[PDB]
RNA sequence: GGUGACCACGGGUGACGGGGAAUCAGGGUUCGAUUCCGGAGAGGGAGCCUGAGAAACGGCUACCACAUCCAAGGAAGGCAGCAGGCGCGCAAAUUACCCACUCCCGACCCGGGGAGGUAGUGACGAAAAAUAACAAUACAGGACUCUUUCGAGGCCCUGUAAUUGGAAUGAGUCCACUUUAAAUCCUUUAACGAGGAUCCAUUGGAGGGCAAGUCUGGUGCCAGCAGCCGCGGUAAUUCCAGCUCCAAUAGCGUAUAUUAAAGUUGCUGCAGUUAAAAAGCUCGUAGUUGGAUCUUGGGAGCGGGCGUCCCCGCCCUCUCGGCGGGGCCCGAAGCGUUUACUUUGAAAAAAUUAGAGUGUUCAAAGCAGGCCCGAGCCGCCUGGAUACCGCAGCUAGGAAUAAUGGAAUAGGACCGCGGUUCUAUUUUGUUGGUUUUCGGAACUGAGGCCAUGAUUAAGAGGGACGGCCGGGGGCAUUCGUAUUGCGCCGCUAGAGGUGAAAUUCUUGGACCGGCGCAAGACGGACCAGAGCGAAAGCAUUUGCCAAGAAUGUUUUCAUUAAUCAAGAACGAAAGUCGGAGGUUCGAAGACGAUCAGAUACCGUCGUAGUUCCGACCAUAAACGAUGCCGACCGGCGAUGCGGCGGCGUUAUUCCCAUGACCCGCCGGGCAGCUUCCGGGAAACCAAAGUCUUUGGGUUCCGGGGGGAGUAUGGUUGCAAAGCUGAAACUUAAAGGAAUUGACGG
RNA sequence: AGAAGACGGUCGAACUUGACUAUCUAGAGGAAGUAAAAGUCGUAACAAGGUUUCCGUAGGUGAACCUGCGGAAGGAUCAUUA
């Protein structure tokens, strides 16, 4: 079920059983890698890179094609963001909610959702701290969030 | 969330047996599930079973022979010794004539009679009779 | 339901000792207030001095006068009411006697139709009430 | 600085700790002042001398409290040692004998020992075990038997009364011996010692539980009995008695603590819709619990029989292998993580427990004993086991389960080759110059090689993205009629209200009809067992702000998760404070009715409130009277949202889509019908199922009814109050669901 | 060699004062709760209990209780039609 909702939706992705690259795919590992490099230089998150790549270039799974994941490739070359994408989007959402609240304080619903989003941010940050992705003294603050994101 | 895949497998088998189904599908497969089903198979309480291999945790389809009464689990895997195994036998098994307690020992997953025969204790997994 | 984890024994033990205060027997035996309130003070029997011979009406469905004695206990100086349990033993009882008193049978609770009487007389003037009733021995005149 | 929710600190203890005791399916629950071990104390503290050893008390000093003598100047005390008193109490024994045994002390074979032994009191408790047995007549009973009821005897077994009727024995008197330090007792043995063998068995009961009387006489709701139901108001199976029975028996009753019963504390193993009970809702740290995944298959005769069973052998490395140079061998060092777990071994006082052996006259016990003696047996054979001993610690095997890690900005592993600093020793034996890369350690560069190094992507989760969807929320805006008031116009005596009236408004125009204006509320019908929200809750239009579920996804991260003490956000209505606003309604209040009364129900007004903004409050039958996450277990027809397919109808246009219908499928929802899935006390419930065939994870919470959600303490609040929360005392029921009846304005 | 005694130091009983902390306990009077039973006033709950009942909150009344606001059915409706 959802972490912060009474919902039990099942919508996922069903990866096929065949890890083999399709015969009609002509792009090779280095070509897909350079395509990823130019998309990242355009400034797209790994999720967007995968979506664009699959929707237009016919690649099914970047990992199945190249042997590594999009984030792994970006880390290996050295042009990936220091802030994880999901954390970044979470702080962005919290910043938007707080910006809305400071103008509409009577939105008790918005205050509630802000509490939920902050809890998700802190739990994700705790996980990243234990995995050494974030510095051990990385603290999320309601005042510094707007500077941290955008 | 799902925290005991063996418990879920055993409950699914128990329900299918009580409904009289000829086959049942356990969705998450594990090595402990395979070994537990193997000892049940060797004693004859179930028939052939199949491990469907997806690239995730596989599935299992077991054939029920209709000769299973209860195949429950003991979820906290207690430390059992050869001195207190018989108290577990009395508490769980319906009688001394039949029924089995399965435990994982350093010699492998086995039933209590074989564990006593090779003189070792372990962690109780479940029971079936 | 209840927790079953391999290292939940602290929670299980704490919950047992926390919930054990919720039944009357354990609370009575382990708080001390009942022992303090007990006129016998945790003793099976106790000696006292007869202050007055009184009659107590039985409960509603019955109709009788139960013969009891007001008794001042020689220890801690408390006044209780003790039932004189036979056909004519109130005549054996007189004023200012050293009477041995026991509980009535169900652990500081009223018994039968007698209201608020928790004690009964076993001996009077150091001679057994049963002996006096049976006529085995006479009052020391 | 140190210690704390993994419970510090403080308080209590009717707490000396342990070996152990009681109870005895298993698990446990209580008790251990008490003879063994350890500790402490000698009226309470404190300080010391001597001594190896004392903060000694049958040593000393002082104070505090008790208390002895006195010629009043002084002096002397410490029984929680053995006896014995007082006091306290429900509650516990002789001011006895002896160092004979076991040991101890001493200068010591010789003395001493209230240690200790012996006896006395001793129904704490435990073991054994009398109070009678037999024979023959009668009167019965038996498959009795002889003839097939009638009568008897070739039999067996009870009971009743008798010169029966004479056998047997202790219990007691008591000679002696014996025991013993002296004895007492027991065991022996003379003499007496039994026919109401009156040498006398009791304690509790006879309605039910619970074994035993519908007996007789007294009492008459009294006396009393009765643990609980109950009995007793004139023939009481229940009281008081007589008789007769019943239970246990030299013992039985009673009170009280405690254990089982109690699956009524529930770890095994309880419950939480209605019985007592799940927090109003959500977040969330501790705590607890956490998906799958890494060596499996194959070998040699031994082998639970390649006898295709399988004792089972599995077909880590490097250092002298100790039997400067032999293969004839097995010792020195490290583990290619650290644990948890399991098995083994050591170490675990005795007593107690289980238990081996042993005729104590049997037994409780005890740790003893037995063997042949033809008398020389000038002594032989034995035992005084074993098991258990938790948890923690030590040792050696195993490596399944669970946690833990190794190489991702390579600061990676391994083979060498460079280039860097020191040093036990050398013998380039007269010392001295010493060469010592000598042997290995000091730092660091360029390489080769590793198949060079990232498990998968959970019908786990987070995030991104796409088109939607929704009385979800906030701000602004807009509209609707109604109500009330006002301003005009018209005609009229009523209007309003009720069961009937009345209070009330009215020829000053009330009510009504028409047109405007204003204000404040509220968003009808559409509106549903429909939607959304964590709940509380949410309904005129339009715009803006963020938010959200579900669906779709061959997108991304890769365990990031579930529930949660403490802490926190939101929380109907009412209520409080302040400011706006006040149309309707309307606590309080007034009046009119009604009534026996009517402080009400009804009517006319009407304050606070009801509306908005800000600050509080934190409660509802905040309900589904029903925790959350997860898995499985029937059928059917619908409905809301999303997606995927399909005949056809419709909307436009010249065609597809794309909307409205029609037939399906999938997933997430609010629900409904049905079912002998199953459950449950049932009502009922596809969850309240998968529960004695009892264990998926985790939170809260109940323990007969009252007292009582009370008192007190703390804390929060402006207050009202909220949270946390007993006890004394009282009671044998209170309750739940169903059934039958009776009754119902 | 040495006794009495004295200064200082140190342990430090004991007394006085003050603080804290555990129990126990007296108390004029007040206010509850039980029990007793046969009293008085009414009839609030059980039937639509004669105003459906109950919950929260607030006010009021001799007393049970009444009333306003929101809620529940444990209701006296599982239902009301194009
Ligand atoms: Mg003590
Ligand atoms: Mg002791
Ligand atoms: Mg001792
Ligand atoms: Mg000496
Ligand atoms: Mg001492
Ligand atoms: Mg001393
Ligand atoms: Mg006799
Ligand atoms: Mg009788
Ligand atoms: Mg018990
Ligand atoms: Mg119960
Ligand atoms: Mg209830
Ligand atoms: Mg946590
Ligand atoms: Mg696992
Ligand atoms: Mg009128
Ligand atoms: Mg409100
Ligand atoms: Mg106001
Ligand atoms: Mg009005
Ligand atoms: Mg759980
Ligand atoms: Mg109770
Ligand atoms: Mg007064
Ligand atoms: Mg009423
Ligand atoms: Mg009524
Ligand atoms: Mg009803």
Swiss-Prot record, chain A:
Ubiquitinated at Lys-26 by RNF14 and RNF25 in response to ribosome collisions (ribosome stalling). There is a cross-link at residue 42 (Glycyl lysine isopeptide (Lys-Gly) (interchain with G-Cter in SUMO2)). It comes from Homo sapiens (Human). PANTHER family: RIBOSOMAL PROTEIN S15P/S13E, SMALL RIBOSOMAL SUBUNIT PROTEIN US15. The keyword Nucleus applies. One of its GO terms (cellular component) is ribosome. Component of the small ribosomal subunit. The ribosome is a large ribonucleoprotein complex responsible for the synthesis of proteins in the cell. Part of the small subunit (SSU) processome, first precursor of the small eukaryotic ribosomal subunit. During the assembly of the SSU processome in the nucleolus, many ribosome biogenesis factors, an RNA chaperone and ribosomal proteins associate with the nascent pre-rRNA and work in concert to generate RNA folding, modifications, rearrangements and cleavage as well as targeted degradation of pre-ribosomal RNA by the RNA exosome. This is Small ribosomal subunit protein uS15. The keyword Ribonucleoprotein applies. The modification Phosphoserine is found at residue 29. Gene3D superfamilies: 4.10.860.130, S15/NS1, RNA-binding. Belongs to the universal ribosomal protein uS15 family.
From Swiss-Prot, chain B:
The modification N6-succinyllysine is found at residue 87. One of its GO terms (cellular component) is nucleoplasm. Its main location: cytoplasm. It holds the Pfam family Ribosomal_S8. One of its GO terms (molecular function) is RNA binding. It is found in: Cytoplasm; Nucleus, Nucleolus. GO terms for biological process: cytoplasmic translation; positive regulation of cell cycle; positive regulation of cell population proliferation; response to virus; ribosomal small subunit biogenesis; translation. The keyword Lyase does not apply. Keywords: Cytoplasm, Diamond-Blackfan anemia, Nucleus, Ribonucleoprotein, Ribosomal protein. Gene3D superfamilies: 3.30.1370.30, 3.30.1490.10. Transmembrane segments: none annotated. PROSITE patterns: RIBOSOMAL_S8. InterPro entries: Ribosomal_uS8 (IPR000630), Ribosomal_uS8_CS (IPR047863), Ribosomal_uS8_sf (IPR035987). Component of the small ribosomal subunit. Part of the small subunit (SSU) processome, first precursor of the small eukaryotic ribosomal subunit. During the assembly of the SSU processome in the nucleolus, many ribosome biogenesis factors, an RNA chaperone and ribosomal proteins associate with the nascent pre-rRNA and work in concert to generate RNA folding, modifications, rearrangements and cleavage as well as targeted degradation of pre-ribosomal RNA by the RNA exosome. Required for proper erythropoiesis. Component of the 40S ribosomal subunit. Part of the small subunit (SSU) processome, composed of more than 70 proteins and the RNA chaperone small nucleolar RNA (snoRNA) U3. PANTHER family: 40S RIBOSOMAL PROTEIN S15A (PTHR11758). HAMAP family: Ribosomal_uS8_A. Belongs to the universal ribosomal protein uS8 family. This is Small ribosomal subunit protein uS8. The lineage of its organism: Eukaryota, Metazoa, Chordata, Craniata, Vertebrata.
UniProtKB/Swiss-Prot annotation, chain C:
The modification 3-hydroxyproline is found at residue 61. One of its GO terms (molecular function) is RNA binding. The modification N6-acetyllysine is found at residue 134. The modification N6-succinyllysine is found at residue 53. CDD domains: Ribosomal_S23. Hydroxylation at Pro-61 affects translation termination efficiency. InterPro entries: NA-bd_OB-fold, Ribosomal_uS12, Ribosomal_uS12_euk/arc. Residues 1-25 are annotated as: Disordered. It is found in: Cytoplasm, Cytosol; Cytoplasm; Rough endoplasmic reticulum; Nucleus, Nucleolus. There is a cross-link at residue 36 (Glycyl lysine isopeptide (Lys-Gly) (interchain with G-Cter in SUMO2)). One of its GO terms (biological process) is cytoplasmic translation. Residues 1-19 have a biased composition (Basic residues). One of its GO terms (cellular component) is cytosol. Pfam families: Ribosom_S12_S23. Keywords: Acetylation, Cytoplasm, Deafness, Disease variant, Dwarfism, Endoplasmic reticulum, Hydroxylation, Isopeptide bond, Nucleus, Ribonucleoprotein, Ribosomal protein, Ubl conjugation. PANTHER family: 30S RIBOSOMAL PROTEIN S12 FAMILY MEMBER (PTHR11652). It is linked to Brachycephaly, trichomegaly, and developmental delay: An autosomal dominant developmental disorder characterized by brachycephaly, ciliary trichomegaly, dysmorphic features of the face and hands, hearing loss, and developmental delay with short stature. Intellectual disability and autism spectrum disorder may be present in some patients. Component of the 40S small ribosomal subunit. Part of the small subunit (SSU) processome, composed of more than 70 proteins and the RNA chaperone small nucleolar RNA (snoRNA) U3. Component of the ribosome, a large ribonucleoprotein complex responsible for the synthesis of proteins in the cell. The small ribosomal subunit (SSU) binds messenger RNAs (mRNAs) and translates the encoded message by selecting cognate aminoacyl-transfer RNA (tRNA) molecules. The large subunit (LSU) contains the ribosomal catalytic site termed the peptidyl transferase center (PTC), which catalyzes the formation of peptide bonds, thereby polymerizing the amino acids delivered by tRNAs into a polypeptide chain. Belongs to the universal ribosomal protein uS12 family. This is Small ribosomal subunit protein uS12. It comes from Homo sapiens. The gene is RPS23.
